[PDB]
Automatic annotation (TrEMBL), chain A:
Domain D-isomer specific 2-hydroxyacid dehydrogenase NAD-binding: 106-284
Entry superkingdom: Bacteria
Organism field: Microcystis aeruginosa FCY-28
Alphabetized SUPFAM superfamilies for the sequence: Formate/glycerate dehydrogenase catalytic domain-like, NAD(P)-binding Rossmann-fold domains
Keyword Glycoprotein: no
Domain D-isomer specific 2-hydroxyacid dehydrogenase catalytic, chain residue ranges per copy: 6-316
Name used for this protein in its record: McyI
Entry keyword annotation includes Disulfide bond: no
Family: Belongs to the D-isomer specific 2-hydroxyacid dehydrogenase family.
Keyword annotations of the record: Amino-acid biosynthesis, NAD, Oxidoreductase
Listed Pfam families: 2-Hacid_dh (PF00389), 2-Hacid_dh_C (PF02826)
InterPro entries, per database record: D-2-hydroxyacid_DH (IPR050857), D-isomer_2_OHA_DH_cat_dom (IPR006139), D-isomer_DH_CS1 (IPR029752), D-isomer_DH_NAD-bd (IPR006140), NAD(P)-bd_dom_sf (IPR036291)
GO BP term, example: amino acid biosynthetic process
Length: 329, 329
C-alpha cells in the first residue's frame, strides 16, 4: 500500500483516518530538513502543515512521489517548480475557513467600536466610572472599507451592510466592480478615497509582492484619526513599526490584529501597550467546522491523485501530462 | 418522504441521475417551455439546469420549497442568480470538469483553421483534389496566439499551443497575475489593443460578465489583422455575432471557429453558415466521456449536499447561505 508523509499533523484527525484506510502514514512534528529527507524517500504522497517548508532538494529525494497537499490556501513554502519538473501534483485547500474568519472579523470590528476588552478590564478593577469618559461607537451608518474583496472580504462586506447598516467601500484591482455591487458595496479605483472615507478599514488581501508592507505610515496618515484598522489576512501586509508610530501619534484610533510580522510576535512588541489595541493569536480561521473541512479535503485530494484522479485544487495543472508519463501509460 | 429534484434537461452522464435517485425522486424534462418548468417545479427541493436551458426569476418564485440550483458546467448566465439569492436558494456551478476537453477542442479548431481542414475535405469528396495547387496552408510554428481570459481553460490552451506547436502566446486578463502566464510560457499584456494588433489567432476563454458581454464587436475586429482568425469556446454573448458576420464580409478578419453562439442554439438561417473559413461545433468542446462523468457526479453530489444542509464547494452566491439556513432550519 502507498505511503504518505505528514510534515505536521492535519487540523482534524478525521483526515488522518481517511488516509489510513488506504495508506501507511508517518507524522513528523516541525521536522528539520534532514528529518524530512530520511522519511520522504519511499512515499507516494506528502501533506504539509502551514507554515512548514518543502524544499526542492527534499522533493528530488522522493522518487515515487505523486502528490503534495498543503493545509490551506498557501503554497509559498512549496517549491512548485521542482514538483512540476518531477511530475508531482501540488494541491492546496482553499476557502475552508471563510465563515470562521468572517465571524472573527465581525467580532473584532464590534469589539473595537464597543471598547469591549478595555471595559471588561475596567469593571473587573472596580473602575466602573470609566463610563463617564467613554463614547462607544454605533456601527450603523458608519463606513467600512474592505481591502481585498475575495472570499472573506465579500462575506464581511455583505453582513456589515445587510445586518449592521454600514456603508461599505472596497478596494481590489483584481475583481470586477460588479462583484462589490452584488453584495451592496462600492468598488473604488483609488485606495486613497477608501482611506479618507472609512471609519473602519479591514484587510482581506492575498499576500503578494504588491501587498507586502502596503499598510505603512503613508497609508495611516491618509486614514481618519478616528478610524480603526483590522487585519485578519497576513502579518506582512502591515508594517508593524509604522503602525506603532501611527497609534503613538494618533494618526488612527486603534487596531485589531489576528496576524503579525514577525509571527510569534516578540515579548517586546510595543503594540501591546495600547488599550485601543485588540489582539488574537492567528486563530481567525480556527473552528472545529473549518479544521474538519480542510483536513477531509486534503486527505481526499491525496487519495484522488494516488488513484490517478484529477483533484479539484491543482496548483500546477501543467504537470499532469508528465505525471501521466511517470505513473500511468 | 424523499425530496424531489427537477432536471431541466438531462445530465451528460447517467451516473449523476443514479446518485440522485439513491435519495430523491427525480423528473427529467427535455427542452421544456417556461410553462412546463412552472408546472414541474412547484414542489421540488433541487433543480439541475442543462445549458442553454433558462431558469427565470418567475419560475424560481413559484418554487416554494427550492433549496439548490445546479448548473451543468461553469457558466451561470442561464440562471437568474439574483432571484435565487432573494429566495434563499443556493446556486452551485460545476467548474473545471471539462478543462482538458476544451483545451483539446480549441487546439483542434486552431489547427483546422490553419490547415483549412473542413474545406479541403469537402473539396476532395466533391472531386476537386486539384484545389491543392491554389492552397497555402499556414505553419503554426512561431505564429502568435492571443488568449482573452487566462483562466483554467485559457492557461491550458496557452500551455498546449506552446508545447505542441511552438506558437508565441499573448494573454489579456486584468484579474490574474502576470506570473500565471510566465509559468506556461505566455506573456500577459495590460492593453487588449496590443494583443489584437499582434495576434494571428485570437481565442476567447473569459467568464461572461457585463464587462465581456459583446466585447468582440466591430471596433475590435477592425483592430484584428485581416489575416487573423477568431476562436470562441467560451460564451456566445462575448461576441457580437452580427458584427462578426460584417467583419467576415468586409475582410476585417479571415475566418472563425465557434463552439458557442448567441442565439444559442443558433437559427436555421444564421448568416455565418455561408462564409468562407468558418468552422462550427454545437457546444461540444467540453463534452467528452471523462468530462461528462466528472461534471454529472459533481452536480449530483452538490445537490445532495445542500439538501442535507451541508455547504457545497462551488456556491456561486455564498451571501445567500444565511437565508438558506433561515428557511432550511
Ligand atoms: N487569520 C486566519 O486565520 C486566516 C485564515 C484564512 C485566510 N486568511 C488570509 O486572509 C486573506 C483573505 O483570504 P481569502 O480566502 O478571502 O482570499 P481570496 O484569495 O479569496 O481573496 C484575496 C483577494 O485579495 C485581492 N488582492 C490581491 N492584491 C490586492 C491588492 N493590491 N489590493 C487589494 N486587493 C488585492 C485579490 O484580488 C483577492 O480578491 C488571505 O491573506 C488569507 O491568506 C487568514
Ligand atoms: N463546451 C464549452 O464550450 C465550454 C466548456 C467549459 C467552459 N466553457 C466556458 O469557457 C469559459 C472559461 O471557462 P474557465 O473554466 O476557464 O473559467 P475561469 O473562471 O477559470 O476563467 C475565466 C477567466 O476570465 C477572465 N475574465 C474575467 N473578466 C475578464 C475580462 N474583462 N477580460 C479578460 N478576461 C476576463 C477571468 O479573470 C478568468 O481568468 C467560460 O465562459 C465557460 O463557461 C465552455
Amino acid at each position: 500500500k502507498h505511503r504518505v508523509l505528514l510534515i505536521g499533523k492535519m487540523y482534524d484527525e478525521a483526515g488522518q483516518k481517511l488516509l489510513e484506510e488506504s495508506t501507511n502514514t508517518e507524522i513528523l512534528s516541525n521536522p528539520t530538513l534532514d528529518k524530512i529527507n530520511e522519511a520522504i524517500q519511499e512515499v507516494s504522497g506528502v501533506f504539509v502543515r502551514y507554515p512548514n517548508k518543502l524544499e526542492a532538494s527534499s522533493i528530488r529525494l522522493a522518487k515515487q512521489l505523486k502528490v503534495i497537499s498543503t493545509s490551506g490556501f498557501g503554497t509559498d513554502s512549496i517549491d512548485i517548480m521542482a514538483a512540476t519538473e518531477q511530475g508531482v501534483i501540488v494541491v492546496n485547500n482553499p476557502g475552508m475557513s471563510t465563515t470562521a474568519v468572517a465571524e472573527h472579523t465581525l467580532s473584532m470590528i464590534l469589539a473595537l467600536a464597543k471598547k469591549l476588552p478595555f471595559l471588561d478590564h475596567c469593571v473587573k478593577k472596580g473602575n466602573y466610572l470609566i463610563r463617564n469618559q467613554m463614547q462607544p461607537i454605533q456601527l450603523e451608518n458608519k463606513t467600512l472599507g474592505i481591502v481585498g474583496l475575495g472570499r472573506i472580504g465579500t462575506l464581511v462586506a455583505h453582513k456589515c451592510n445587510l445586518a449592521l447598516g454600514m456603508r461599505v467601500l472596497a478596494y481590489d484591482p483584481y475583481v470586477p466592480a460588479s462583484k462589490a455591487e452584488t453584495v451592496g458595496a462600492t468598488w473604488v479605483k483609488d485606495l486613497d478615497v477608501l482611506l479618507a472615507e472609512s471609519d473602519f478599514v479591514s484587510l482581506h488581501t492575498e499576500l503578494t509582492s504588491e501587498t507586502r508592507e502596503m499598510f505603512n505610515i503613508s497609508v495611516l496618515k491618509k486614514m481618519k484619526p478616528t478610524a480603526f484598522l483590522i487585519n485578519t489576512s497576513r502579518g506582512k501586509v502591515v508594517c508593524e513599526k509604522d503602525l506603532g508610530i501611527a497609534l503613538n501619534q494618533k494618526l488612527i484610533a486603534g487596531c485589531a490584529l489576528d496576524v503579525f510580522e514577525p509571527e510569534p510576535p516578540a515579548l517586546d512588541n510595543p503594540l501591546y501597550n495600547f488599550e485601543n489595541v485588540i489582539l488574537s493569536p492567528h486563530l481567525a480561521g480556527v473552528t472545529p467546522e473549518a479544521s474538519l473541512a480542510a483536513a477531509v479535503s486534503a486527505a481526499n485530494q491525496i487519495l484522488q491523485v494516488l488513484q490517478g484522479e484529477k483533484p479539484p485544487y491543482m496548483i500546477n495543472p501543467e504537470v499532469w501530462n508528465l505525471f501521466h508519463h511517470h505513473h500511468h501509460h
